[PDB]
Amino acid sequence: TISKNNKMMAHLNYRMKIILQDGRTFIGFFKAFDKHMNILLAECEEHRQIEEKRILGLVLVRGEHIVSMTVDGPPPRDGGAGGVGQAKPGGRGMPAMP
Amino acid sequence: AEELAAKEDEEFNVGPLSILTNSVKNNHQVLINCRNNKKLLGRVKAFDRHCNMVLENVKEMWTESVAKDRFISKMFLRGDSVILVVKNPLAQAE
């Protein structure tokens, strides 16, 4: 998946939950990475067991400390176009009959 | 890409890695000491400069203290955990 360059983006912009080697859990929208597995998380938060929450912001995690990451949530979200004809109202002309 | 994955195997004829070289081709069990303070005893069937190995027919033992052990049919070991590899005197050539 990730870093297979034809599918580099395989989890980009997903909401992902990141576990660090100190046992912290960060959560955020994973939207960049590096060859050193550095990652940049937008709208990031941290979570701990009791569940305790804190807001961080745009977090850059140095890759050295990442244990693992998982998909937490979908990316945010929002017959084509053309045309030639017209569709004025009308009525049925009566034809001939036998 | 793969050129430096194939050229690698020259130095292992003579370097300290020879205990792995003999462990493979003559099929000696080796008692690979690892981090986690655990011992793996098994026949290496491949290895590399980084000291990865694939182990057949493994006995894992440690103290938990009371002795506990686990049997693993096949394993890949990441070489960064390898402290110390020993040709086990409790085994032989096979």
Binding site: G93, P95, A96, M97, P98 | -
Partner: protein, 71 residues
């Protein structure tokens, strides 16, 4: 399509009673397939028979020398 009730004029002929739009019949625009239209002309011209052009043709499936059409 409910038929007109009552008798019919003795004086007017069937030609004169007929539904019409011009002096001689009911002209109306049409859209045939150009290929099949040409096929039917040439069958009538060359063979003497063609498939019937009428809408609601009923039993009269062939026109012209119908004996050849069936044979």
């Amino acid at each position: 399509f409910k038929p007109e009730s009552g008798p019919v004029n003795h004086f007017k002929s069937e030609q004169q009673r007929s539904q019409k739009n011009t002096l001689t019949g009911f002209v109306e625009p049409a859209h045939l397939n150009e290929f099949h239209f040409n096929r039917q002309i040439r069958s009538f011209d060359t063979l003497g028979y063609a498939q019937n052009p009428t809408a609601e043709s009923g039993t009269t499936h062939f026109v012209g020398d119908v004996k050849k059409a069936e044979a």
